[PDB]
Design a protein around this ligand. Structure first.
Ligand SMILES: [Cl-]
Ligand SMILES: [Zn+2]
Ligand SMILES: [Zn+2]
Length: 256
């Protein structure tokens, strides 16, 4: 018995389709580049928003870190902008955005330095990320960086964001070391490798790769990937190790 009275008609809900699935498929990670109070004001203006805001060191109550929610999950937030991941565009529509309070980068004697993420912030992020993934059956290759989906425009969350520590906790994609090793084929890690080959691999993993991009545009794409997946060097140049890693990721998780 599922008969709902509506105005002008009634609804029989006793028969339920098997082909029914979530509208949320992707979880997206950001940094605020600002203090908490500025961030908060900004994420609640009329230009941008997000679903969660995590302070740099969450305050505790009941013995529990407090995280702020600004948009209810069932609705979209304006966080991703112009974006593209694994064949999808308009990523606001199909994603949840978490904002973390972090400084980002600044030039410090002309040298583009990034700011590290507090243990206490990650500790709070874990439980939340886990709940969201479980709720919507999000797949690990779809836990991403803002930069992963907007490679020409965004850097966040940057190379100091601990993707690997999180993978150990069933949070987001990460290759098997053995298989990376295999795919290196005993080349030295920094051995130059065909640029176009690497882009083809990157496009198929999910990166927005257009035909006829400028050498600068090609570097941004490779650079984005390196910040997530090989943070020791992210100069956007193509090399044996970078390719090995993409090769290993497409093996473990595929093209969707
Ligand atoms: Cl209170
Ligand atoms: Zn962002
Ligand atoms: Zn309050």
């Amino acid at each position: 018995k599922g008969i709902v009275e509506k105005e002008g008609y009634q609804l029989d809900t006793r028969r339920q389709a098997q082909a029914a699935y979530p509208r949320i498929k992707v979880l997206v990670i950001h940094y605020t580049a600002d203090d908490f109070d500025s961030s908060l004001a900004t994420l609640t203006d009329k230009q941008v928003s997000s679903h969660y805001l995590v302070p740099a060191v969450p305050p505790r109550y009941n013995g529990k870190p407090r995280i702020w929610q600004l948009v209810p999950e069932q609705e979209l937030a304006w966080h991703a902008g112009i974006s593209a991941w694994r064949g999808a565009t308009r990523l606001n529509d199909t994603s949840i955005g978490i904002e973390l309070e972090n400084r980002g980068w600044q030039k410090s004697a002309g040298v583009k330095y990034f700011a590290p993420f507090e243990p206490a912030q990650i500790q709070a992020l874990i439980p939340l990320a886990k709940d969201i993934i479980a709720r919507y059956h999000i797949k690990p290759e779809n836990v991403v960086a803002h930069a992963d989906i907007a490679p020409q425009r965004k850097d966040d969350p940057g190379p100091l964001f601990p993707w690997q520590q999180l993978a150990q906790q069933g949070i987001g994609a990460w290759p098997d070391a053995q298989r990376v090793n295999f795919y290196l084929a005993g080349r030295a890690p920094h051995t130059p490798v065909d640029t176009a080959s690497l882009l083809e691999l990157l496009a198929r993993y999910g990166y927005d790769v257009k035909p006829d991009m400028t050498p600068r545009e090609q570097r941004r794409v490779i650079m984005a990937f390196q910040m997530h997946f090989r943070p020791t060097l992210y100069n956007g140049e193509a090399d044996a190790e970078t390719q090995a890693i993409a090769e290993a990721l497409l093996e473990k998780y595929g093209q969707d």
